[PDB]
Amino acid sequence: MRHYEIVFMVHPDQSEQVPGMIERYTAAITGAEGKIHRLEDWGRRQLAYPINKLHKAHYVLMNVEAPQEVIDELETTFRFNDAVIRSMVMRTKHAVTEAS
Amino acid sequence: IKVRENEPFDVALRRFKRSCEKAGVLAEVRRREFYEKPTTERKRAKASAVK
Amino acid sequence: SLSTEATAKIVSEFGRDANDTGSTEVQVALLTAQINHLQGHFAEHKKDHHSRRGLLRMVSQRRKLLDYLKRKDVARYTQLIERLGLRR
Amino acid sequence: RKQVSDGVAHIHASFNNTIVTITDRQGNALGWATAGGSGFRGSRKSTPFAAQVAAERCADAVKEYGIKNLEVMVKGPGPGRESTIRALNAAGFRITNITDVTPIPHNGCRPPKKRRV
Amino acid sequence: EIDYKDIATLKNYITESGKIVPSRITGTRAKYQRQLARAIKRARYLSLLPYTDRH
RNA sequence: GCUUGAGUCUCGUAGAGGGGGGUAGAAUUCCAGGUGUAGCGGUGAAAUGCGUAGAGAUCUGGAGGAAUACCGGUGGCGAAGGCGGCCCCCUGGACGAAGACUGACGCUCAGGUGCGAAAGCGUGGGGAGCAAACAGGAUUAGAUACCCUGGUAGUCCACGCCGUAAACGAUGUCGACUUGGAGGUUGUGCCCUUGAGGCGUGGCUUCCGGAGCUAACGCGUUAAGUCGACCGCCUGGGGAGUA
């Protein structure tokens, strides 16, 4: 059970489905007795460059400690889900809890 | 890159072009992939930068 | 390399006590543990020729220590290679 | 005709020729002029003079549109380009932006060998 | 430097056309120039910063 | 027996070390479409080439492949070959701090085995750019070249082969001792930090130089100095690294 920092953009037009998804994702973490340390919803933020053109998107910062298998199925969940564009999951850098 | 029109100007005189792209970066990418001449061109460039 | 809990378990099994972590049986058993784990790693990959060089250092070093312990105490040798299942 | 009143001057200076294309903000060309199409074929079509007369000649041939404002977009290196934008504010245009839009790869394609001259 | 989400800090250490500035200019000891650049690149993936100014 | 050699354990650090998988942004080419019109491209100059069947320029959408600007640095890592976007997974080594443990377990190494750029070969993919061969245009006395326009193998992937390079610090490996200076990079301790602190202690590395050595050039605590251990190799040029 190691640490991870997940961010992911969401299509703006499915922003209302954002907290639901968050819950499901967090639920999946608690399926493996891993804990979630911070969680931020950064709002519809303007993109520095267009992607499918699609400017301003909805960001979610996560920072979860978990075993690697639920992180892996969380990655495949981010693959198939058409809502989410650009996930990024990262390193341990042991558990953080702050803002930016 | 971009410079907006000023309210009272005749010549914009943008220096944006000079600080980056024109002189070196495009004249460098006109000619061959080596790996070899750059290692020695940089070797003698850093060996020339001496007092 | 190996887990801290794994290394602690092997030191506890093969040493006179814990903190006896440099004895010849202990070093041999730690090298053995890592050799087997990396058998699992190099069955896959197979072209990780750099990591394999580290592995052959482990094999050679285990061999040196078995030769030492063979020409110091042969009873410890036979008990050791009996317990680790090496020598074939 | 069609009375666009703002455009973009895409100047494409290369080492051998400068080619000036005045368009609108949508990107549809309204009229172009090259340095090689203004007399002086050859060693003389890559000079600042040839580029400025190319730009003078491209300022003509867009009189049918009433362009007063334009952005300038500059590609490539070349003996042109600098003189080129000068000719544009010698032709009554209000020059608004001057961007340099030279394509730079982020180490993409391999460039050609050449030139053991 | 260690962090990439602070794009105020990262935006100081970048030029007007999206390019990373050399440590020959900004001081920045080499360890933090390496963390810096790697954080700039993680931020450009997330579209927090731009890769260039002609997107 | 013993610990000053060698090794194990604890905690961290830096890193383009390796292998597998994914993704991102610029750019080149191609395809489809809009605008638009007489050239574009190229060169020392030209021509071949592309272009009123609408090129080049320009904007939109798509496909695909390869490489990964800036950071980038006589910077880093690796035994060497070599390794440069970002992220994950598996994995090798190095270095540092204090302490504990084993107790000479070490050094070198003929045969042997492994790894080994590039080009090349085999099977199966892929193929955007570049480009041996090749073709055309020039240049020229000639031009089987340099230059130009195209362009196939190849370069890219998987697995196997080859087994070499100016594979080079043209400097075998390991250990010990012998004046200095300026840097770089990565650890760390101490002390008003009361800066852009001070003072030390390691690892790797760059430049200059002292004694000494050297035919000289130069090397110079990372030795080509002063020694020890083991290995490899040399014995005039050619013929010939050939039969």
XYZ file of C-alpha atoms (C1' of nucleotides) in Angstrom:
654
model
C 0.000 0.000 0.000
C 1.903 3.027 -1.334
C 0.983 6.674 -2.015
C -0.299 8.218 -5.237
C -1.319 11.639 -6.451
C -4.180 11.469 -8.957
C -5.352 14.517 -10.920
C -7.833 14.315 -13.748
C -9.639 16.770 -15.986
C -13.342 16.233 -16.713
C -15.266 17.410 -19.798
C -17.023 20.683 -18.715
C -20.438 19.530 -20.002
C -20.408 16.635 -17.531
C -19.342 18.805 -14.564
C -22.596 18.019 -12.730
C -21.587 14.346 -12.716
C -18.277 15.246 -11.042
C -18.961 14.739 -7.291
C -20.790 11.441 -7.945
C -17.753 10.105 -9.786
C -15.566 11.326 -6.929
C -17.634 9.318 -4.476
C -17.425 6.175 -6.637
C -13.670 6.602 -7.016
C -13.218 7.166 -3.312
C -15.511 4.164 -2.679
C -13.180 2.027 -4.812
C -10.249 3.105 -2.635
C -12.151 2.062 0.467
C -12.812 -1.277 -1.257
C -9.129 -2.102 -0.694
C -8.842 -0.626 2.838
C -6.725 2.201 1.471
C -7.231 5.713 2.796
C -7.650 9.040 0.979
C -5.678 11.938 2.403
C -6.678 15.106 0.573
C -9.312 15.719 -2.072
C -9.833 18.917 -3.975
C -12.299 20.005 -6.587
C -10.606 22.856 -8.419
C -13.595 24.059 -10.436
C -13.822 24.814 -14.125
C -10.372 26.186 -14.785
C -9.174 27.721 -18.072
C -6.868 25.446 -20.096
C -3.508 26.847 -21.237
C -3.989 25.160 -24.622
C -7.018 23.651 -26.370
C -7.667 19.891 -26.278
C -10.459 18.497 -28.602
C -10.700 22.040 -28.733
C -12.594 22.213 -25.449
C -11.251 25.085 -23.278
C -12.006 25.520 -19.572
C -12.186 22.102 -17.894
C -12.964 20.689 -14.424
C -9.994 19.492 -12.330
C -10.004 17.070 -9.395
C -6.943 16.482 -7.167
C -6.941 13.272 -5.157
C -3.770 12.146 -3.188
C -4.661 8.596 -2.201
C -2.707 5.907 -0.371
C -3.701 2.509 -1.709
C -2.437 -0.854 -2.959
C -1.397 -0.687 -6.571
C -4.132 -2.902 -7.976
C -7.017 -0.496 -7.259
C -4.907 2.308 -8.613
C -4.444 0.269 -11.754
C -8.179 -0.360 -12.186
C -8.688 3.325 -11.410
C -6.374 4.046 -14.363
C -8.413 1.748 -16.661
C -11.554 3.464 -15.369
C -9.970 6.717 -16.505
C -9.105 5.053 -19.860
C -12.585 3.917 -20.829
C -14.591 6.785 -19.266
C -15.330 9.330 -21.979
C -16.019 12.015 -19.361
C -12.463 12.225 -18.125
C -9.704 13.608 -20.349
C -6.123 13.703 -19.071
C -5.627 11.790 -15.917
C -2.220 11.811 -14.250
C -1.277 9.530 -11.368
C 2.095 9.936 -9.631
C 4.696 8.935 -7.052
C 4.638 8.184 -3.372
C 6.459 11.259 -1.943
C 4.845 10.208 1.303
C 1.312 11.323 2.170
C 0.633 15.014 1.751
C -2.205 17.178 3.074
C -2.123 20.914 2.162
C -3.668 23.223 -0.499
C -1.859 25.083 -3.315
C 5.609 36.585 -31.122
C 2.607 38.887 -30.539
C 2.749 42.591 -29.855
C -0.500 44.572 -29.625
C -0.919 47.942 -31.309
C -0.095 50.828 -29.001
C -2.431 53.804 -28.795
C 0.150 56.291 -30.040
C 2.916 54.585 -32.017
C 4.534 54.618 -35.429
C 6.862 51.654 -35.105
C 6.221 48.688 -32.834
C 9.893 47.677 -32.971
C 9.236 44.294 -31.373
C 12.352 42.493 -30.145
C 10.377 39.390 -29.509
C 11.887 37.762 -32.553
C 15.496 38.243 -31.455
C 15.482 36.805 -27.926
C 14.791 33.230 -29.074
C 14.014 31.880 -32.581
C 15.452 33.501 -35.663
C 19.245 33.563 -35.514
C 20.203 30.184 -34.149
C 17.276 27.873 -33.696
C 16.037 27.727 -37.283
C 19.483 27.845 -38.944
C 20.442 24.884 -36.684
C 17.569 22.623 -37.879
C 18.384 23.052 -41.598
C 21.050 20.300 -41.728
C 22.081 16.792 -40.590
C 21.341 14.587 -37.663
C 24.912 13.609 -36.347
C 25.235 12.954 -32.651
C 28.948 13.406 -33.395
C 29.670 16.898 -34.672
C 27.502 18.403 -31.805
C 29.485 16.561 -29.161
C 32.669 18.147 -30.573
C 31.108 21.508 -31.456
C 29.865 21.733 -27.849
C 33.168 20.372 -26.597
C 35.131 23.147 -28.334
C 32.467 25.740 -27.562
C 32.829 24.981 -23.821
C 36.619 24.634 -24.267
C 36.722 28.064 -25.988
C 34.683 29.706 -23.192
C 37.769 30.111 -20.960
C 39.914 32.987 -19.586
C 16.480 -5.046 -3.600
C 14.480 -6.996 -1.003
C 11.857 -5.983 1.553
C 12.887 -4.849 5.019
C 10.479 -7.360 6.537
C 11.904 -10.144 4.342
C 15.529 -9.348 5.244
C 14.568 -9.179 8.916
C 12.855 -12.571 8.626
C 15.902 -14.216 7.070
C 18.276 -12.684 9.596
C 15.975 -14.028 12.313
C 15.938 -17.535 10.772
C 19.618 -18.021 9.954
C 21.558 -15.873 12.441
C 22.537 -16.684 15.999
C 20.132 -13.865 16.846
C 19.015 -10.590 15.284
C 21.947 -8.138 14.863
C 24.034 -11.107 13.694
C 23.419 -9.951 10.171
C 26.843 -10.490 8.610
C 27.347 -14.153 9.277
C 28.119 -16.338 6.342
C 24.885 -18.365 6.427
C 22.882 -15.165 6.653
C 24.579 -13.506 3.696
C 24.178 -16.676 1.687
C 20.476 -16.860 2.514
C 19.851 -13.210 1.611
C 21.628 -13.620 -1.702
C 19.589 -16.770 -2.261
C 16.314 -15.001 -1.572
C 17.114 -12.278 -4.020
C 18.336 -14.736 -6.670
C 15.048 -16.610 -6.578
C 12.933 -13.467 -6.620
C 14.795 -12.229 -9.680
C 14.341 -15.669 -11.328
C 10.742 -14.481 -11.390
C 11.731 -11.080 -12.761
C 14.067 -12.371 -15.537
C 11.728 -15.133 -16.751
C 9.955 -12.028 -18.079
C 11.939 -9.201 -19.693
C 14.814 -11.397 -20.689
C 16.649 -8.476 -22.301
C 17.351 -6.597 -19.105
C 21.016 -7.233 -19.537
C 21.968 -4.608 -16.916
C 19.947 -5.993 -14.106
C 21.299 -9.384 -14.989
C 24.769 -8.214 -14.436
C 23.678 -7.380 -10.870
C 22.205 -10.864 -10.638
C 25.428 -12.568 -11.735
C 27.252 -10.557 -9.100
C 24.848 -12.112 -6.577
C 25.450 -15.598 -7.913
C 29.220 -15.199 -7.894
C 29.288 -13.681 -4.447
C 27.118 -16.516 -3.062
C 29.545 -18.919 -4.603
C 32.533 -17.323 -2.950
C 30.855 -17.463 0.423
C 29.881 -21.103 0.027
C 33.493 -21.887 -0.829
C 34.662 -20.070 2.311
C 32.185 -21.780 4.561
C 32.951 -25.097 2.918
C 36.637 -24.820 3.802
C 35.942 -23.524 7.304
C 33.171 -25.735 8.685
C 31.707 -28.458 6.481
C 28.860 -29.276 8.896
C 27.565 -25.707 8.575
C 27.948 -26.138 4.802
C 25.865 -29.284 4.619
C 23.180 -27.932 6.976
C 23.128 -24.683 4.982
C 22.824 -26.012 1.433
C 20.501 -28.689 2.815
C 18.185 -25.982 4.172
C 18.334 -23.628 1.153
C 17.762 -26.367 -1.424
C 20.654 -25.263 -3.565
C 23.494 -27.389 -5.092
C 20.732 -29.363 -6.965
C -16.163 44.003 -52.666
C -17.089 42.221 -49.418
C -15.429 44.950 -47.308
C -13.488 43.035 -44.701
C -11.719 46.026 -42.984
C -9.259 43.837 -40.999
C -6.896 41.123 -42.174
C -3.664 39.288 -41.474
C -0.465 39.710 -43.490
C 1.178 36.297 -43.547
C 4.730 36.945 -44.763
C 6.665 33.726 -45.587
C 10.287 34.692 -45.824
C 12.551 31.832 -46.784
C 16.152 32.011 -47.853
C 15.317 32.057 -51.541
C 12.031 33.943 -51.676
C 9.545 35.931 -49.601
C 5.910 35.437 -50.312
C 3.366 37.804 -48.766
C -0.276 36.711 -48.441
C -2.867 39.162 -47.144
C -5.904 37.426 -45.756
C -8.776 37.980 -43.324
C -9.091 36.908 -39.701
C -10.848 33.713 -40.790
C -7.767 32.706 -42.830
C -9.158 33.058 -46.388
C -6.654 34.668 -48.727
C -7.485 37.967 -50.343
C -4.402 38.390 -52.531
C -0.739 37.492 -52.557
C 2.546 38.682 -54.050
C 5.929 36.973 -54.187
C 9.330 38.477 -54.549
C 10.026 36.245 -57.535
C 6.912 37.479 -59.361
C 8.022 41.138 -59.307
C 10.815 40.894 -61.840
C 14.288 40.028 -60.484
C 14.397 36.342 -60.853
C 17.286 34.559 -59.136
C 19.965 35.956 -56.807
C 17.943 39.152 -56.525
C 14.644 37.634 -55.370
C 16.090 37.041 -51.969
C 16.874 40.579 -50.849
C 15.097 43.017 -48.580
C 14.358 45.193 -51.607
C 12.550 42.402 -53.414
C 10.564 41.632 -50.317
C 9.547 45.251 -49.874
C 8.392 45.583 -53.481
C 6.588 42.288 -53.034
C 4.811 43.778 -50.037
C 4.065 47.011 -51.936
C 2.589 44.921 -54.700
C 0.526 42.870 -52.204
C -0.759 46.105 -50.641
C -2.035 46.831 -54.137
C -4.550 44.146 -55.218
C -6.302 44.263 -51.844
C -7.714 47.762 -52.463
C -11.072 46.069 -53.229
C -11.449 45.175 -49.525
C -10.723 48.402 -47.611
C -8.294 46.837 -45.177
C -7.073 49.296 -42.535
C -5.991 47.116 -39.624
C -3.906 43.983 -39.984
C -1.838 41.602 -37.916
C 1.511 40.487 -39.307
C 2.531 36.832 -39.074
C 6.151 36.087 -40.022
C 7.537 32.650 -41.017
C 11.002 31.494 -41.784
C 14.267 33.349 -41.791
C 15.332 35.421 -44.662
C 16.710 38.587 -46.111
C 13.093 39.659 -46.280
C 10.626 39.930 -43.451
C 11.977 42.969 -41.624
C 11.796 45.283 -44.637
C 8.541 43.572 -45.510
C 6.614 44.874 -42.535
C 8.136 48.328 -43.162
C 6.566 48.381 -46.618
C 3.217 47.561 -45.004
C 3.241 50.726 -42.829
C 4.499 52.592 -45.840
C 1.171 51.591 -47.477
C -1.222 53.195 -44.986
C -1.959 50.057 -42.983
C -2.345 50.280 -39.225
C -0.014 47.470 -38.205
C -1.505 45.983 -35.014
C 0.375 42.761 -34.107
C 3.683 41.414 -35.269
C 3.909 37.718 -34.395
C 6.738 35.411 -35.552
C 5.230 32.041 -36.340
C 8.286 30.069 -37.585
C 7.641 26.337 -37.203
C 10.073 24.892 -34.633
C 10.031 21.120 -34.073
C 10.378 19.765 -30.575
C 13.008 17.418 -32.047
C 10.740 15.955 -34.710
C 11.765 14.930 -38.218
C 15.369 14.426 -39.333
C 16.645 17.355 -41.416
C 18.401 16.734 -44.709
C 22.121 15.990 -44.933
C 23.425 18.515 -47.075
C 25.970 20.935 -48.328
C 29.582 19.892 -48.652
C 30.027 22.920 -50.906
C 10.472 23.804 -7.603
C 9.532 20.638 -5.667
C 5.902 21.303 -6.628
C 4.243 21.738 -9.984
C 0.744 22.836 -8.966
C 2.091 26.234 -7.756
C 2.079 27.749 -11.212
C 2.860 31.241 -9.965
C 6.313 30.051 -8.981
C 6.645 27.949 -12.173
C 5.458 30.899 -14.250
C 8.309 32.985 -12.901
C 10.755 30.303 -14.089
C 9.655 30.238 -17.723
C 9.919 32.702 -20.559
C 7.166 34.608 -22.347
C 6.937 31.907 -25.039
C 6.599 28.881 -22.764
C 10.298 27.916 -22.665
C 12.195 26.958 -19.532
C 14.789 29.567 -18.535
C 18.394 28.408 -17.969
C 19.956 28.344 -14.515
C 22.743 30.424 -16.086
C 20.152 33.280 -15.850
C 18.049 32.691 -12.760
C 20.619 31.311 -10.290
C 18.745 28.149 -9.191
C 21.226 25.480 -8.045
C 21.170 22.524 -10.379
C 19.121 20.176 -8.222
C 16.256 22.677 -8.217
C 16.697 23.440 -11.885
C 16.133 19.723 -12.535
C 13.094 19.534 -10.190
C 11.970 22.767 -11.739
C 12.075 21.586 -15.348
C 10.459 18.253 -14.526
C 7.661 20.133 -12.691
C 7.232 22.523 -15.645
C 6.789 19.485 -17.910
C 4.264 17.817 -15.577
C 2.373 21.152 -15.585
C 2.446 21.451 -19.362
C 0.855 17.975 -19.560
C -2.014 19.150 -17.338
C -2.499 22.331 -19.316
C -1.714 24.426 -16.293
C 1.119 26.037 -18.301
C 1.456 26.224 -22.093
C 3.976 24.345 -24.238
C 4.293 27.385 -26.427
C 2.452 30.620 -27.187
C 0.986 29.505 -30.518
C -1.475 26.789 -29.557
C 42.574 -15.949 16.804
C 42.196 -10.281 15.547
C 40.452 -5.964 12.806
C 42.751 -1.597 9.982
C 41.224 -5.558 3.466
C 36.408 -7.760 1.752
C 31.367 -8.347 2.744
C 26.117 -8.141 5.457
C 22.223 -5.188 8.026
C 19.605 -0.191 9.521
C 18.288 5.054 7.336
C 18.441 8.292 3.399
C 20.292 10.809 -1.216
C 21.116 12.011 -6.423
C 20.802 9.929 -11.255
C 19.173 10.233 -19.693
C 21.379 2.881 -15.427
C 18.112 -1.373 -17.638
C 13.371 -3.866 -19.289
C 7.905 -3.615 -20.132
C 3.412 -0.490 -20.797
C 0.819 4.064 -21.544
C 0.347 9.090 -22.851
C 1.453 14.479 -24.468
C 2.911 18.737 -27.424
C 5.395 21.065 -31.476
C 6.898 19.938 -36.479
C 7.418 17.243 -41.474
C 4.570 14.317 -45.163
C -0.030 12.583 -47.081
C -5.652 12.909 -47.756
C -10.419 15.677 -47.991
C -12.444 20.607 -48.099
C -12.656 26.667 -48.052
C -10.226 31.271 -49.783
C -7.073 32.721 -53.762
C -3.999 33.337 -58.057
C 0.521 33.091 -61.235
C 4.106 31.267 -60.221
C 6.688 27.791 -56.621
C 11.095 25.232 -55.637
C 16.307 25.371 -56.294
C 21.216 27.335 -57.033
C 27.330 30.596 -57.352
C 24.158 30.834 -61.578
C 20.841 27.516 -63.733
C 18.036 23.445 -65.186
C 15.495 18.829 -64.024
C 10.948 18.984 -60.703
C 5.991 20.813 -59.138
C 2.021 24.470 -61.196
C -3.971 27.528 -64.513
C -6.448 19.624 -64.523
C -5.336 25.660 -59.843
C 0.579 24.826 -57.390
C 3.100 27.667 -53.699
C 0.796 30.733 -49.680
C -3.351 30.324 -46.110
C -7.399 28.169 -42.792
C -10.270 23.751 -41.063
C -10.739 18.537 -40.244
C -8.345 13.713 -40.372
C -4.392 9.733 -40.732
C 0.264 7.905 -39.837
C 5.291 7.252 -38.509
C 9.697 8.680 -36.249
C 12.196 11.903 -32.876
C 11.496 13.840 -28.324
C 13.089 21.693 -28.824
C 13.610 25.013 -24.060
C 15.710 22.644 -19.388
C 21.048 21.194 -21.163
C 25.752 22.392 -18.281
C 34.477 20.000 -20.074
C 26.168 18.270 -16.057
C 24.589 12.934 -14.625
C 24.302 7.483 -14.750
C 26.455 2.999 -16.626
C 31.948 -2.342 -16.785
C 32.215 -0.903 -21.712
C 28.882 -0.299 -26.103
C 25.714 3.524 -24.519
C 21.425 6.079 -22.077
C 17.542 12.796 -23.045
C 9.454 14.567 -23.192
C 6.031 13.061 -19.054
C 3.632 9.005 -16.050
C 3.167 3.843 -14.025
C 5.046 -1.161 -13.156
C 9.330 -4.698 -12.581
C 14.665 -4.081 -11.617
C 20.520 -3.241 -11.220
C 24.310 -0.306 -9.122
C 26.644 3.853 -6.557
C 27.313 7.287 -2.506
C 26.679 9.306 2.349
C 25.515 9.144 8.379
C 25.931 6.525 12.909
C 25.846 1.751 14.884
C 25.857 -3.523 14.767
C 27.640 -8.323 12.565
C 30.982 -12.002 9.783
C 35.805 -12.484 10.345
C 40.834 -12.578 5.264
C 35.782 -14.611 3.137
C 40.904 -10.885 -0.811
C 43.571 -9.290 -5.870
C 44.474 -10.773 -10.835
C 43.114 -14.275 -14.529
C 45.358 -18.224 -19.642
C 41.323 -21.488 -21.696
C 35.807 -20.647 -20.766
C 31.268 -17.544 -20.569
C 28.490 -13.217 -20.994
C 27.510 -8.124 -22.741
C 29.143 -5.495 -27.093
C 27.768 1.466 -31.591
C 26.963 1.506 -36.637
C 26.452 -0.993 -41.061
C 24.877 -5.881 -42.476
C 21.851 -10.842 -42.419
C 17.103 -14.062 -41.427
C 11.686 -14.328 -40.465
C 7.241 -11.210 -39.603
C 5.398 -6.155 -39.188
C 5.841 -0.959 -40.129
C 7.300 3.027 -43.316
C 6.221 10.268 -41.879
C 11.160 12.294 -42.480
C 16.088 11.164 -44.082
C 18.624 8.372 -47.547
C 23.341 4.106 -49.779
C 21.744 2.061 -54.793
C 19.348 4.253 -58.827
C 17.351 8.045 -62.271
C 17.272 12.791 -64.237
C 19.558 18.292 -64.227
C 23.974 20.747 -63.884
C 29.399 21.538 -63.203
C 33.527 19.821 -65.906
C 38.238 18.431 -70.663
C 35.824 14.143 -68.474
C 32.434 13.839 -63.575
C 30.490 6.675 -62.718
C 31.707 12.910 -57.630
C 31.025 17.360 -54.752
C 25.753 20.854 -55.953
C 20.179 20.375 -57.456
C 15.350 17.415 -58.113
C 13.358 12.737 -57.152
C 14.293 8.173 -54.724
C 14.483 1.931 -53.150
C 17.014 -1.143 -49.372
C 17.986 0.851 -44.741
C 16.995 3.740 -40.541
C 11.612 2.139 -36.655
C 9.182 -2.511 -33.920
C 9.441 -8.234 -32.334
C 12.631 -12.386 -32.141
C 17.309 -14.656 -33.721
C 22.338 -13.860 -36.022
C 26.868 -11.095 -36.692
C 30.812 -9.564 -33.644
C 33.327 -5.385 -35.336
C 34.926 0.548 -34.857
C 39.849 6.362 -34.345
C 35.012 0.024 -29.596
C 40.168 6.201 -27.865
C 41.610 9.012 -21.680
C 45.189 5.736 -28.979
C 46.777 4.970 -21.318
C 44.697 -3.425 -18.497
C 42.957 -4.485 -13.396
C 43.624 -4.051 -8.038
C 46.189 -1.751 -3.830
C 49.783 1.823 -1.250
C 52.635 6.459 -0.847
C 54.179 11.516 -2.725
C 53.866 19.754 -2.727
C 49.363 22.977 -4.603
C 45.399 26.305 -6.884
C 40.493 27.346 -9.255
C 35.911 25.042 -10.377
C 31.563 21.539 -11.154
C 28.279 17.777 -9.072
C 26.170 14.778 -4.956
C 26.044 13.510 0.421
C 26.603 15.308 5.611
C 28.211 17.293 10.656
C 29.251 21.442 13.582
C 28.996 26.480 14.898
C 24.587 34.075 16.461
C 21.832 32.135 10.151
C 21.915 36.991 13.089
C 24.329 37.756 4.105
C 24.924 36.649 -1.280
C 26.544 32.583 6.856
C 31.166 30.493 8.601
C 34.101 25.949 9.547
C 34.954 20.828 8.422
C 34.436 15.863 6.408
C 33.349 12.034 2.318
C 31.990 10.098 -3.432
C 32.544 11.321 -8.566
C 34.457 14.806 -12.027
C 37.002 19.500 -15.129
C 41.060 22.949 -15.947
C 46.111 24.717 -14.713
C 50.449 23.506 -12.605
C 55.208 21.653 -8.437
C 58.777 17.681 -7.656
C 59.421 13.624 -10.359
C 59.285 11.273 -15.023
C 59.486 11.628 -20.314
C 62.994 11.319 -26.965
C 60.359 15.456 -26.821
C 55.382 16.688 -26.730
C 53.422 16.424 -22.411
C 51.592 13.551 -17.727
C 51.265 15.733 -13.171
C 47.316 12.788 -5.824
C 41.918 10.514 -11.525
C 50.303 10.037 -13.001
C 52.916 8.890 -18.069
C 55.908 10.137 -10.263
C 57.602 6.328 -6.251
C 56.375 0.830 -5.509
C 53.863 -4.194 -5.207
C 50.447 -8.467 -7.501
C 48.517 -10.721 -11.752
C 47.152 -10.628 -16.862
C 47.458 -9.035 -22.155
C 50.760 -7.581 -26.009
C 55.694 -5.878 -28.844
C 60.591 -7.110 -31.503
C 62.761 -3.032 -38.695
C 59.469 -1.413 -43.319
C 56.801 -3.971 -47.074
C 54.716 -8.556 -48.412
C 50.365 -8.918 -44.424
C 46.904 -9.024 -40.653
C 47.387 -11.532 -46.388
C 47.616 -16.905 -48.203
